[PDB]
Write an enzyme that holds these catalytic residues in place. Structure first.
Site, short mmCIF file in Angstrom:
data_model
loop_
_atom_site.label_atom_id
_atom_site.label_comp_id
_atom_site.label_asym_id
_atom_site.label_seq_id
_atom_site.Cartn_x
_atom_site.Cartn_y
_atom_site.Cartn_z
N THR A 1 0.85 -1.22 0.00
CA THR A 1 0.00 0.00 0.00
C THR A 1 0.86 1.24 0.00
O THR A 1 1.90 1.29 0.64
CB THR A 1 -0.93 0.06 1.22
C1 LIG Z 1 -1.75 -2.09 2.18
C2 LIG Z 1 -0.66 -2.79 2.31
S1 LIG Z 1 0.36 -2.75 3.67
C3 LIG Z 1 1.69 -3.88 3.33
O1 LIG Z 1 0.96 -1.45 3.76
O2 LIG Z 1 -0.30 -3.28 4.83
C4 LIG Z 1 -3.13 -2.71 2.11
C5 LIG Z 1 -4.21 -1.64 2.36
C6 LIG Z 1 -5.55 -2.12 1.91
C7 LIG Z 1 -5.81 -3.26 1.22
N1 LIG Z 1 -7.15 -3.38 0.98
C8 LIG Z 1 -7.79 -2.30 1.51
C9 LIG Z 1 -9.14 -1.97 1.52
C10 LIG Z 1 -9.50 -0.80 2.14
C11 LIG Z 1 -8.55 0.03 2.74
C12 LIG Z 1 -7.22 -0.29 2.73
C13 LIG Z 1 -6.81 -1.48 2.11
N2 LIG Z 1 -3.25 -3.80 3.05
C14 LIG Z 1 -3.46 -5.06 2.66
O3 LIG Z 1 -3.73 -5.35 1.51
C15 LIG Z 1 -3.33 -6.14 3.72
C16 LIG Z 1 -1.87 -6.44 4.00
C17 LIG Z 1 -1.61 -7.38 5.18
C18 LIG Z 1 -0.13 -7.71 5.28
C19 LIG Z 1 -2.10 -6.78 6.48
N3 LIG Z 1 -4.01 -7.35 3.30
C20 LIG Z 1 -5.19 -7.69 3.81
O4 LIG Z 1 -5.69 -7.15 4.79
C21 LIG Z 1 -5.92 -8.84 3.13
C22 LIG Z 1 -7.02 -8.29 2.21
C23 LIG Z 1 -7.70 -9.38 1.44
C24 LIG Z 1 -7.65 -10.71 1.69
N4 LIG Z 1 -8.40 -11.39 0.77
C25 LIG Z 1 -8.95 -10.50 -0.10
C26 LIG Z 1 -9.78 -10.71 -1.20
C27 LIG Z 1 -10.17 -9.60 -1.91
C28 LIG Z 1 -9.77 -8.32 -1.55
C29 LIG Z 1 -8.96 -8.11 -0.46
C30 LIG Z 1 -8.53 -9.21 0.28
N5 LIG Z 1 -6.47 -9.73 4.13
C31 LIG Z 1 -5.68 -10.37 4.98
O5 LIG Z 1 -4.56 -10.75 4.67
C32 LIG Z 1 -6.22 -10.58 6.37
N6 LIG Z 1 -6.70 -11.93 6.61
C33 LIG Z 1 -5.88 -12.58 7.63
C34 LIG Z 1 -6.36 -13.99 7.86
O6 LIG Z 1 -6.31 -14.75 6.66
C35 LIG Z 1 -7.10 -14.13 5.67
C36 LIG Z 1 -6.64 -12.72 5.39
#
Ligand SMILES: */C(=C\S(C)(=O)=O)[C@H](Cc1c[nH]c2ccccc12)NC(=O)[C@H](CC(C)C)NC(=O)[C@H](Cc1c[nH]c2ccccc12)NC(=O)CN1CCOCC1
Ligand SMILES: */C(=C\S(C)(=O)=O)[C@H](Cc1c[nH]c2ccccc12)NC(=O)[C@H](CC(C)C)NC(=O)[C@H](Cc1c[nH]c2ccccc12)NC(=O)CN1CCOCC1
Ligand SMILES: */C(=C\S(C)(=O)=O)[C@H](Cc1c[nH]c2ccccc12)NC(=O)[C@H](CC(C)C)NC(=O)[C@H](Cc1c[nH]c2ccccc12)NC(=O)CN1CCOCC1
Lengths: 195, 236, 211, 211, 221, 211, 211, 195
Positions: free
Chosen positions: D1
């Site tokens: 992100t």
């Molecule tokens: C930025 C990246 S970072 C490395 O700086 O954290 C993004 C910010 C982001 C992504 N999506 C949105 C939506 C609204 C606002 C902000 C957003 N962060 C991420 O993408 C997360 C990074 C992890 C390392 C924390 N990823 C997630 O949260 C995953 C999102 C997701 C998972 N499946 C999907 C299908 C479709 C669309 C989106 C997703 N989810 C996860 O990894 C969290 N759970 C943990 C348990 O196992 C399942 C996933």
């Protein structure tokens, strides 16, 4: 952490490093000189890591390359030098690893000005611009943005000034003292920069 | 615990406990609050036994936080408890919002507390009416009046307590918009002495400005009281 | 798994009618999310009829390539002949297993031509995939390897078409690689595709995503 | 992100990428990381998408009830304090939130960075996410408070592009919004960074770009 | 620690050493490890000294309250029940190994109680770090229906064995003889260890030898 | 422990003929080797005939002192009499054991006078030492506590002399404390010695080492 | 431990404390932390006393044989390189060594800091031990290359005193040696820091000094 | 790490802190303002630690003290304020600890100018000079050496300049931006210093 920066143009190579010798929470020296290893025949090894490993690996490589050049009455190519360094680092990785990052710069007629990026895992590749340390995160995009082909030495130095200003302003470690090695017109020059 | 419904509906639709709280308020002292361009003036009646009571101890004109001040009429102990609640809520609002609590918010909180005490089992209504002077988030001076029933309203000049009707009529007759500090203080003193015996030790006056709440000096109150006395003597 | 994620990278290989193709991503990573190079090729030529795609840890890729070049050059100079694709595949398997209990973290593929003599010579497409300790999967349609293996497997299962000319083979392999790379964080930043024909090699760089 | 925001002479510029990932797999390329809390406050979210979305909705509910009760618009400072206190109450549970709240209130334009650890930093320029360092470098090298709207939008777009180029966790589309006294506009609804790469770094498109 | 107890005819004899140790250092040379629960009940403690002291005080006062309320003689069985239930409640985290001895309507009674809350009715027992040496002596020499004097001598021998063979035991030997009508607490009973070398004269520092920075004198009224 | 080594500190108590003495080191430490204060007294007066020396973690020392002052003041105001030294010692034991499974990291001593009435009153020296969970050692000659316990025990075993006047008692206790402190890295930086007599208290600061 | 060395217009000033400790127990107050490797080289040792002493004796043996063979005096740089290589060969075994080698050779006055990790830093001013930070602050606040011998000795003495005062691991006596072209002198053989404190910080001795 | 410095004289108290707001390897701000908590009635709480804990504890203490002063129509004494802060920190130590170091400065007629040093373990004591952070190791001896009784405000500021120069020269984190709060002549002044 030691921030190393390297920029390769059609007519030059510039290497830059912070001049801090760090021992725990105190800076032993603001004018450290244990990171650059100049090798006869327009080659330079810029190392970053623990001072002990840095010294050992840098001197080992420099003496081996000088021995090669004396035995063969010739200048080692920059590519040969870079891959020799990578081979030695890889050899020691699985036995007694040196925790050193390398920027290998040089000039030779066959391939012109060359810059190679190598990490402590011995992952190497030739690049036009590279960086090591936690300052890489803050200088890599500046290099990407302001780099272009047919850049001049002074424009490269301006890019480096931008990088140093960014490292002074936004980096956790306010680094203000840098040493630059410039290879161009078959001469090597040293500069000291303070921001 | 004890949760009997102390406040209940009378056959005619009234809350007799609230009426009795109003009677307790009417048995209290007199407090007047007048608003001006960017400051307020609050006068309150004092009742001290001369030479034996300590005048400074009793305080009907109090400060809630750096910008809100309060006067009250009714039961002093109930007033003290409510004022401590209000000060705690001022600091809680500051902690939760990173900004000082505005006068409208604090008046609403006080009114809500009084309503809750009329509407909770095992408790009796607060027997006090309050005048709260302060500034809003847009740095605008405002005066609110709250009653035992919990109904609040903003005012330009208001009097509470014993013989509040006479003082309110005098204010409606003698109030002008955007007065200067001295004229506003004179108006407040005249309004309060419309029902309180004319004497410089029968009243305590404060002027609230954005900077702070400053109590008027005894010599100035003496001079103003003498002027009022001269005017009364001339009129008669 | 973390060691493979450190750099990323993916290699793919496909066969057509009298042609093969080998594709790779061009990224070099660091700490699994920092891109340091966008021209780190993972395809190496052993001889005219043998190519190896090496993905995994970059240092292990370079080391294995140097070892393989050494072995192939010695074999070819001794025999005065080009090394057979099957012989190279078996040698690669044995080299990988020689480090069984301290292996190279590389997942290779071998793509090339098997030559059969009758006058003329028949070129038969040849594809093999490996795991890091030399387990070998000999295949006739497509081989994949790298962190993008699942995406590549899905794309190749859905889109591979048997017995395609060089143009259709290039289009199919490029589409498979690009679609698989678009879903990987740690792979991409350019794609290199080689199409092998018995008489010429076509090298193409794809206009890919660089994010 | 990569999310970024900065104050300039005509208001605030907010910009984000559109990539979501789970591990090394790109889950989506079209998520919305800029949300509107009310008419005059925008929040850019980074970290755990679910945590960010849920707690921004919670903050929106609290702000709506506050505004209805008090007949006034909440301030960015108060909203940031509410959010930071709520997040701090959960310290040590695993929340992953980095939010930049930027908005216009009676005290001009305001920008606060709030974290899941209870941080609340007032500032003029913030960047969050895995590309935050690259965005920071690009913004710092060319930031000025007297930029026109077009220049500011271009600077934000360039910073997001470079962050996506260098960081494997950022990519997809770039969105740029402009907060001004009367609300906010979406200058760039969403722009694929694929075109940005071949506009900025490889305009000629005659060879693979070498980083 | 070496604590022990035995049952002789119409009496219970408890003995203890008097050393408290903090690691390898003797924190107390003359600590009292025999505690009065009631006129006819006593205990000896081993383990964590703070736990032992608190628990014995609590048991003593609860037993006195029970005696006042019931207007009857306290019972060793009641003490055992209370102690074991408490120790079990705490699951051995109150490290208290107790030799509880007393005389009631059921005659002389000796109990061993362990930190986890188990108890056993015994003719003789020993606990502490010197318990094995004391047990050797008791197993060698014990017999039923010993005279009170013979039991005192045997308890002294057992405690001395513990004192001189265990590094965590030392000091004097304390004894308590409990009957149905009185208790005799002899402290010390043996006094077998004393400092053996003394300087010819004690070292008295001359006045003013210590340098001081300041001196403030205040008068207590 | 190491928690005691974090600050250091030591307290000592000795008895004479119709007098007692309580001594302490004046250092306050941090991280076991940084001296931040040289006037952190560890002796507290409960009433005219009761003093407590608290060594150990500084926060626990202050907390325990506040609790003890609270309890003693309440007891004394209720009874209209000064608290007895034995009663205070037992109360301290019970308070310390009340935190048995999350204790205060303090190793206290109690030094004072037991008053016996016959006309005149007899003052009997009284010394007790404690461990952190209230185990009590009642002594007639000397009590020690702190990280310097071994050195103090050796010095007091060798040098203590029974039935000394106030002058000899002061000299002996000060010599013991200074010699014991000279061998401790984390204790010292000044020594405070109080000599209690039934009619007066003498407070002295010793010229000690400050290294 | 506090050891320091610095170059000035008349040579090198070397200074140390004399305290040894095991844990929090002061094992000795009269150890010698400055040794002479040869006629013109002094080494100041910190860390593991046994390791420092043994490896300094080893270096002395090597230097003696070198000088006997080559009929020339070894240089400080060469001695530092020998010591650092030897220490590096044992990296990962637990050696504790910080040595400042200061001496005079044909290239003037030279000073190197050598560590057990294989470090070798050439410099003009070094400090080592647990008091190194305090000594560094004192030296940096008042250092000048044009100090007279008396001024330089006073500066070194003051720095050692302050390090001992603030650090619990340093104390005992302060030794100051002067390295000049013709050898070295012991200006201060050993001076108790008791007098230093009561001369620098509490000259009046009217009350306990408050840090 | 946040370096805090405090100096108490017969006529003043000076508190100083670095003005960096740090988030990982980047400095969010070079003019951080989350460390000083000024409290009506000539009191100041200087906090160092994680920004979240710093904000929570500082605002909690400030609002509680302001509530006390409003309820009682009086100024809390500096000693009462310091020990109230220490009691709250100790209370939370064993439940949900704030990882904050405190320098509590103030002035009142009863006891004059007062400075208290408190660590994250809630170990407190009144001092004439104190420091917190990894820069304490480099500034404590300077304070010790150059402090004397009857020091003036300007001499104290010179001592602070020496401390800042030392932190710029020898400290691993080259800290150059500092904020000072000066209490003297019943007025509180803010200063900003760059080295
Ligand atoms: C930025 C990246 S970072 C490395 O700086 O954290 C993004 C910010 C982001 C992504 N999506 C949105 C939506 C609204 C606002 C902000 C957003 N962060 C991420 O993408 C997360 C990074 C992890 C390392 C924390 N990823 C997630 O949260 C995953 C999102 C997701 C998972 N499946 C999907 C299908 C479709 C669309 C989106 C997703 N989810 C996860 O990894 C969290 N759970 C943990 C348990 O196992 C399942 C996933
Ligand atoms: C017997 C020894 S043993 C090896 O069998 O456990 C003695 C029994 C004993 C000692 N004192 C009394 C008093 C009344 C009844 C019984 C008594 N046990 C001990 O001496 C303990 C043995 C250790 C292994 C548990 N020692 C202690 O409990 C220490 C006593 C002590 C320490 N410093 C002091 C200063 C003054 C007075 C007494 C003491 N205490 C500790 O070891 C403290 N720990 C801290 C952690 O929690 C457990 C107790
Ligand atoms: C400086 C301190 S520091 C914190 O900066 O390391 C000193 C430097 C020093 C001390 N003594 C000499 C002699 C010659 C040159 C330099 C010297 N370092 C120390 O004092 C050591 C600090 C530890 C943390 C490494 N301490 C020691 O090495 C101990 C010395 C010692 C032990 N017993 C003694 C009796 C008499 C005189 C000296 C000593 N030794 C050890 O701690 C080694 N341990 C001992 C216990 O068993 C395991 C090994």
């Amino acid at each position: 952490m030691d921030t190393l920066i390297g920029l390769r143009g059609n007519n030059f190579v510039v290497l830059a490093a912070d001049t801090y010798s760090i021992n725990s929470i105190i800076k032993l020296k603001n004018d450290d000189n244990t990171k650059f290893y100049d090798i006869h025949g327009n080659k330079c090894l810029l190392l970053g890591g623990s001072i002990g490993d840095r010294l050992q690996f840098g001197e080992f490589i420099r003496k081996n390359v000088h021995l090669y050049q004396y035995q063969n009455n010739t200048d080692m190519f920059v590519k040969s030098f870079a891959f020799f360094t990578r081979k030695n680092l890889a050899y020691y990785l699985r036995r007694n690893p040196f925790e050193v990052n390398c920027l290998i710069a040089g000039y030779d007629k066959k391939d012109g000005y060359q810059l190679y990026w190598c990490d402590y895992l011995s992952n190497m590749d030739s690049v036009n611009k590279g960086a090591h340390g936690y300052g890489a995160y803050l200088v890599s995009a500046i290099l990407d943005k302001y780099y272009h082909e047919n850049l001049t030495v002074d424009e490269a130095l301006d890019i480096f000034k931008l990088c140093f200003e960014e490292l002074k302003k936004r980096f956790l470690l306010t680094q203000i003292n840098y040493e630059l090695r410039i290879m161009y017109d078959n001469k090597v020059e040293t500069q000291y920069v303070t921001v | 615990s004890y949760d009997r419904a102390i406040t209940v509906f009378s056959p005619d639709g009234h809350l007799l406990q609230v009426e009795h709280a109003l009677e307790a308020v009417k048995k209290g002292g007199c407090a007047v609050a007048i608003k001006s361009s960017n400051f307020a003036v609050l006068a309150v009646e004092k009742k001290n036994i001369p030479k034996l009571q300590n005048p400074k101890t009793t305080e009907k004109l109090i400060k809630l936080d750096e910008h809100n001040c309060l006067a009250f009429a009714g039961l002093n102990a109930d007033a003290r408890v409510l004022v401590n609640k209000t000060r705690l809520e001022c600091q809680r609002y500051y902690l939760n919002m990173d900004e000082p609590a505005p006068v409208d918010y604090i008046a609403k909180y006080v009114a809500k507390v009084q309503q809750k005490f009329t509407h909770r089992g095992g408790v009796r209504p607060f027997g006090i009416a309050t005048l709260i002077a302060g500034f809003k988030n847009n740095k605008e001076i405002c005066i609110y009046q709250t009653e035992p029933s919990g109904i609040y309203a903003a005012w330009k000049a208001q009097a509470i307590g014993k013989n509040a009707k006479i003082v309110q009529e005098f204010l409606e007759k003698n109030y002008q918009e955007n007065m200067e500090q001295k004229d506003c203080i004179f108006l407040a003193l005249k309004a309060i002495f419309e029902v309180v015996e004319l004497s410089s030790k029968n009243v305590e006056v404060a002027l609230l400005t954005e900077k702070d709440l400053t109590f008027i000096e005894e010599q100035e109150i003496n001079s103003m009281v003498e002027l009022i006395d001269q005017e009364r003597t001339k009129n008669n | 798994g973390s060691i493979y994620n450190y750099n990323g990278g993916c290699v793919l290989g496909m066969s057509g009618s009298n042609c093969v193709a080998i594709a790779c991503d061009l990224r070099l990573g660091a700490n699994t999310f920092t891109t340091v190079s966008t021209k780190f090729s993972k395809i190496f030529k052993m001889n005219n009829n043998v190519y190896v795609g090496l993905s995994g840890l970059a240092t292990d890729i370079q080391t294995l390539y140097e070892i393989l070049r050494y072995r192939v050059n010695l074999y070819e100079v001794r025999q005065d002949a080009e090394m057979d694709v099957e012989c190279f595949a078996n040698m690669l398997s044995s080299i990988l297993y020689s480090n069984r209990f301290s292996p190279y973290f590389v997942n290779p593929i071998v793509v090339g031509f098997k030559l059969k003599h009758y006058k003329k010579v028949n070129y038969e497409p040849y594809l093999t995939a490996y795991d890091l300790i030399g387990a070998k999967c000999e295949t006739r349609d497509f081989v994949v390897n790298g962190v993008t293996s699942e995406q590549l497997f899905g794309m190749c299962e859905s889109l591979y078409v048997k017995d395609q000319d060089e143009n259709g083979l290039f289009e199919t392999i490029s589409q498979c690689l690009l679609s698989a790379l678009d879903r990987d964080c740690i792979s991409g930043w350019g794609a290199e595709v080689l199409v092998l024909t018995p008489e010429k090699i076509i090298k193409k760089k794809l206009k890919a995503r660089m994010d | 992100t990569t999310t970024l925001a900065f104050k300039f002479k005509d208001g605030i510029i907010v910009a984000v990428d559109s990539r979501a990932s789970m591990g090394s797999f790109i889950s989506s390329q079209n998520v919305e990381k800029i949300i509107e809390i009310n008419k005059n406050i925008l929040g850019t979210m980074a970290g755990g998408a679910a945590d960010c979305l849920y707690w921004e909705k919670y903050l929106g509910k609290i702000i709506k009830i506050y505004e209805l009760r008090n007949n006034e618009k909440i301030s960015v400072r108060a909203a940031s304090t509410i959010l930071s206190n709520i997040l701090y109450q959960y310290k040590g549970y695993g929340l992953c939130c980095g939010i930049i709240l930027s908005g216009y209130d009676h005290t001009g334009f305001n920008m606060f960075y709030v974290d899941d650890s209870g941080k609340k930093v007032e500032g003029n320029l913030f960047s969050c996410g895995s590309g935050s360092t690259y965005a920071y470098s690009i913004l710092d090298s060319a930031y000025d408070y007297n930029l026109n709207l077009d220049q500011a939008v271009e600077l934000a777009r360039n910073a997001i592009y470079h962050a996506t180029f260098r960081d494997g966790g950022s990519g997809g589309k770039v969105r740029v919004f402009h907060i001004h006294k009367n609300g906010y506009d979406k200058i760039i609804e969403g722009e694929d960074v694929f075109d940005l790469h071949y506009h900025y770094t490889n305009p000629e498109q005659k060879d693979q770009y070498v980083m | 620690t070496t604590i022990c107890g035995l049952v002789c005819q119409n009496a219970v004899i408890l003995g203890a050493d008097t050393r408290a140790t903090e690691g390898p250092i003797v924190a107390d040379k003359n600590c009292s490890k025999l505690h009065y629960i009631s006129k006819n009940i006593w205990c000896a403690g081993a383990g964590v000294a703070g736990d032992l002291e608190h628990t014995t005080l609590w048991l003593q006062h609860n037993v006195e309250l029970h005696r006042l309320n019931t207007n009857t003689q306290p019972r060793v069985s009641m003490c055992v029940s209370r102690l074991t239930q408490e120790l079990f409640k705490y699951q051995g985290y109150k490290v208290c190994a107790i030799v509880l001895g007393g005389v009631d309507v059921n005659g002389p009674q000796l109990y061993g109680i362990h930190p986890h809350g188990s108890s056993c009715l015994l003719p003789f027992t020993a606990l502490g770090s010197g318990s094995l040496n004391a047990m050797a002596v008791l197993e060698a020499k014990y017999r039923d229906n010993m005279t009170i004097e013979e039991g005192k001598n045997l308890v002294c021998e057992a405690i001395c064995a513990g004192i001189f063979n265990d590094l965590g035991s030392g000091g004097n030997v304390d004894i308590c003889v409990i009957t149905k009508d009185s208790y005799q607490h002899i402290r010390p009973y043996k006094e077998p260890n004393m400092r053996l070398y003394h300087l010819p004269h004690p070292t008295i520092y001359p006045k003013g030898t210590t340098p001081i920075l300041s001196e403030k004198i205040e008068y207590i009224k």
